[PDB]
Symmetry: C3
């Protein structure tokens, strides 16, 4: 780490005194999903470069930004452009915003990401309800909680066996049935690899053997610190391509480029997340 408690406190206070908005729900937008910010109403934008203590972008493109607003009526703060480990950011920098949300008064975090499908059943365009995760950087020392614990946020050894709220998963599955979509809402485990290189077949086969249903390079760090803080969490992976799980099928690659989330697939997810704002319990 390198952030004092006061640092987080100072940022949350700064935001609070520059917006009349008071979010209950924070939403991290994954790659190709930033258009969720367009669905906010009465929106107020802050560029990261404007918010004190916020990690500076070293990356191509605009810095990314924090959008306060209402989403189907819900007080939300929305994150467009997350920090990734593969870009050389320490997890304590990646996850900083989650702690600020907590101090902002947020009690719920929704996480979205794009992911390669490991599960034969999954097809490009599917949305996966995240049931559970496998944190490989975590096993080996790369866990955002590393260092002295601050009891003002949470415990030394927080549980993650229950990180994906039972109630919101039951309600997502329920709300999805009224939507009348062609494909059922998938559910499974997100495995986080550090990237940025992509899997070899051999590696794709381990990830499969480890029970992971979909792979990507983000999210878990955030979820973990959310649960440390006692935030309610749920989330979705957009399956942007099927990873090749053998050499036979490796040769059979033809009219191919692992494209970003089909703009229509992204838009389906964005509007599902929006509609689910109806189903989060109110703080009260």
């Amino acid at each position: 780490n390198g952030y004092t408690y006061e640092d987080y406190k100072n940022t949350a206070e700064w935001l609070l005194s520059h917006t009349k908005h008071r979010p209950q729900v924070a939403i991290i937008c994954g790659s190709g999903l930033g258009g969720l910010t367009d669905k906010l109403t009465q929106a107020q934008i802050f560029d990261y470069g404007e918010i004190p203590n916020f990690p500076r972008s070293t990356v191509p493109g605009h810095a990314g930004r924090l959008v306060f607003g209402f989403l189907n009526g819900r007080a939300c703060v929305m994150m467009q452009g997350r920090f990734h480990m593969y870009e050389g950011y320490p997890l304590w920098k990646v996850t900083f915003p989650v702690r600020v949300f907590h101090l902002l008064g947020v009690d719920t975090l929704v996480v979205t990401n794009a992911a390669g499908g490991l599960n034969p059943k999954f097809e490009v365009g599917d949305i996966m309800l995240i049931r559970d995760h496998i944190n490989l950087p975590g096993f080996s020392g790369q866990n955002p909680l590393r260092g002295p614990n601050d009891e003002r946020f949470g415990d030394r050894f927080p549980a993650m066996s229950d990180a994906y709220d039972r109630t919101m998963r039951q309600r997502a599955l329920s709300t999805w049935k009224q939507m009348g979509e062609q494909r059922e809402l998938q559910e499974g485990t997100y495995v986080m690899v550090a990237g940025p290189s992509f899997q070899t077949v051999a590696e794709c086969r381990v990830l499969q053997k480890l029970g992971a249903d979909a792979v990507g390079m983000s999210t878990v760090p955030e979820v973990i610190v959310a649960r440390h803080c006692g935030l309610r969490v749920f989330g979705f992976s957009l399956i942007t391509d099927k990873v090749i799980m053998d050499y036979e099928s490796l040769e059979k690659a033809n009219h191919e480029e692992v494209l970003a989330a089909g703009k229509q697939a992204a838009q389906k997810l964005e509007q599902f997340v929006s509609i689910l704002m109806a189903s989060i319990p109110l703080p009260d």
Copy 2:
């Protein structure tokens, strides 16, 4: 893993301890969480707080400031470590394992490691003692190994074997002593997997750990063993099974009433006295 210790640092600490106690230990014992009461069983003891031992890894003042206790346990010359350092607290593994090299230079030829651990093996129940037969070093697979950096042939080889980390003679004698103690529970035996922590495992993760063949999980010990064997120390150890980790979502919902408590003060005491009794099975130098 950027080792800020010269050989002369280790030697300076070792020699400092050697000129402030008359004790000359053969055996080092690392006390796991909740097992520190082992030190009370030492006779003719002497205490050094980490704070007064040059080059010893420094804290930011939490509740438990650890210490080293020299003395005789069941007749054996011992140095005993109460309060270990953990990776998850932010310490580099070269700080975690610094004491093991000091012990070598003290003249120790045997390291015993104790810890508390989650039970992965269905057969294990809360309060069990597991003889560590082997380990799986997940941090080591990815660069986080305490031997990372140059090798110093004055400690050991570049590429030390870990096939035989947990001494065979002592494992047979552990299992032997236990049988004639006449205990209600069988002495368990299996593989300890190190995960870096500090967050606990999800169900999915707990499953991988099972599939990897691990019988118990914790966040320590493996670093210390590895640098012990690099020095040629005899190693043996135990995990006290503190809780059983949930390994299916079905039993996750049913997880209602409770939390992962510390080592039940009774079961710890049982281990602590088994360790004392096993002092008479360690070979002489």
Copy 3:
């Protein structure tokens, strides 16, 4: 962290302006496999400390010359993660090689055999890898990315060139070797300590045929560059995968049949210089 695009380019040009050699192929020889440098004609030697921005080997040199009709740059005494080196130093030469004009990289290493079939002395055509360190964050591509080198998210499914594997096999049959050319997956572990039986068993279960502490970082950045890659593991020992055959110890002497065995792999890399495509 570490090296900018200029730095690579300055190193490349220094070498270009300090040798008449213009190499097409680069060969990173592993442990005990550097005798291949003696077979180089017109050989021109550079110690690493001599070269701008190079990592200082703290017995490491760069050798240019012709092997079996091919302009080569040879690396004797590679960098290892266990030695304390960060992966961006480990893989620094691979990009210089690219800016030198090299289009093929051949990698050799010493490995422990996880596949029961494998015997000491076997050569393994590396067909694929498992980068265990890379899962957790130790990946040489981590950090800012320059597109003059390659993509942000490069593929590694075809890291080991289809054509050269077919030609390795083809030459091997032509060589009339009694022992078959093994082929499989190399898992990179960080080291330096060797595997426990428990750990060997997970590596086996993971699908790895051979284990070592190098190579993968180089292959990854080479492919990020668009270099053609093929490589070999010499099986120096069968890794103990149970406790029964841990008791059983032997007429110990892993070493000196490893000369005939390392020679075989060296002479095979030589032969294969004729099978690498031209630019």
